[PDB]
Amino acid sequence: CPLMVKVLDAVRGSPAINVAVHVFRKAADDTWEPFASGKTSESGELHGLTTEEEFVEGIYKVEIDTKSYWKALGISPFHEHAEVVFTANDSGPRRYTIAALLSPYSYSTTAVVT
Template identity: 30%
Template sequence: AGVAPAPHVHHQQEHRGDLRGRAEGMSESTAGSVTTHVLNTLTGRPAAGLALRLAQLQGPEPQWVELTQRVTDKDGRCLPLLAPGQAKASTYKLRFETAAYWKDLGHSSFYPYVEVVFTIVDPAQKLHVPLLISPYSYTTYRGS
């Protein structure tokens, strides 16, 4: 005899469908934006409360010009660093203030900050730059 699925299983399936619709809408509305997501690999949780800055290389004698500052939320995310349509074909730098983050958690950090330098070739594309951190390592990659 078969066992009927628990009511919450059905609810989770419906919920996944809702999330899928939201994710599709989000990807359309974030085209041409720059976003990040920071995960604490020591705890396996999002890195909440981590300060970061975005700068752009500008000028005939190239210099870094700060564009925005953010702090990650409880999910390790923040508002887009560049709003849709604001990105330009250029070189950018994301600086994550990791020493202060780890100090607040009672840890020392080998890296006082992490800088990720990247180039936007197609400003119409959404660019996502995830960062995975621990007190003694970090990893980043081009996300989607």
């Protein structure tokens, strides 16, 4: 599993459950095209987005549908989504974890590359 995503809720102190996550890869022009997607588990994790064969060098955008998440909880959100854009495999393949921490008017994201 070369790309994992983990989403935490800073208002409730819990994983962010059932959050929709869409991954895009940048194409020959510049257009963003869909690559992978899923919903966070009860642990706030999304595994099996890709396989190593499919996850080649490139620029990727991970867009976290945080707006719908807060909306489901009846909380007023600021962002349309959180968007994490990065080059992967700059030097061949690695394991990537993209972690996001969500609040209504703020978010932070970090990458663990191993």
